[PDB]
């Protein structure tokens, strides 16, 4: 996260880290057994780490649960990142508590202008490289579809939403993918891609969660 602030220890209980040896993507707990993330974060082997704040330092409140199932959306497009969503079923139910909590799915889509909280352990530089050890947080508004399309001409589908600032300066970045975008307690976005990081007229593009509640619910029920 570029231009944000360090969140308060365990203040984002639904935020998880996807680790395959090292941290490479974020995720969101929506069920004691299910995590939602981005399809491009897929790997045959993935360990889910919840209750995390400082990924480089054992702190006592974290849970390490390996993925038992990793289901990418059938219509995921590797060249356009369309339908960039994925579900992970933990090998064992996560223990829910104050540090480990679920985040609800969207009841309907978020309106443009709505302020949301984007979080993760991705880079914090818009030019160089600086990966934080502590979970970063950012406040950002949902951008209009027209604004999203103009900055990314011909690359935005109906399953994508832009979130951030046209002026650049604040935005998600490498290492945050699969991570959450919650607005008024609802998951509305998933970190997916963009042109650079926190760049001007290149806001972050996120998978639009309010298009997949049925896919999510049906996938969970059938697996």
């Amino acid at each position: 996260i570029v231009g944000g602030y360090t969140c308060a220890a365990n203040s984002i209980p639904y935020q998880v880290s996807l680790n395959s040896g090292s941290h490479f993507c974020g995720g969101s707990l929506i069920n004691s057994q299910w995590v939602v993330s981005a399809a491009h974060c897929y790997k045959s082997r993935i360990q889910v780490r919840l209750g995390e704040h400082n990924i480089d330092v054992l702190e006592g409140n974290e849970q390490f649960i390996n993925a038992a199932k990793i289901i990418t959306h059938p219509n995921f497009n590797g060249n356009t990142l369309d339908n960039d969503i994925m579900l992970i079923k933990l090998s064992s139910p996560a223990t829910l508590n104050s540090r480990v909590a679920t985040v609800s799915l969207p009841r309907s889509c978020a309106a443009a202008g709505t302020e949301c909280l984007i979080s993760g352990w991705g880079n914090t530089k818009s030019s160089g490289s600086s990966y934080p050890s502590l979970l970063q947080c950012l406040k950002a508004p949902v951008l209009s579809d027209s604004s999203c399309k103009s900055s990314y001409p011909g690359q935005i589908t109906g399953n994508m939403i832009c979130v951030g600032f046209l002026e650049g300066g604040k935005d998600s970045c490498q290492g945050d993918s699969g991570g959450p975008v919650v607005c008024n307690g609802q998951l509305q976005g998933i970190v997916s891609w963009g042109y650079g990081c926190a760049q001007k007229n290149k806001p972050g593009v996120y998978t639009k969660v309010c298009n997949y509640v049925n896919w999510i619910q049906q996938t969970i029920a059938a697996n």
């Binding site: 490479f24 974060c41 990142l81 945050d176 699969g178 970190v191 891609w193 963009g194 650079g196």
Partner: peptide
């Protein structure tokens, strides 16, 4: 450059 936001991307 246009990239996914995983690390590495």
């Amino acid at each position: 450059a246009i990239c996914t936001r995983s690390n590495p991307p």
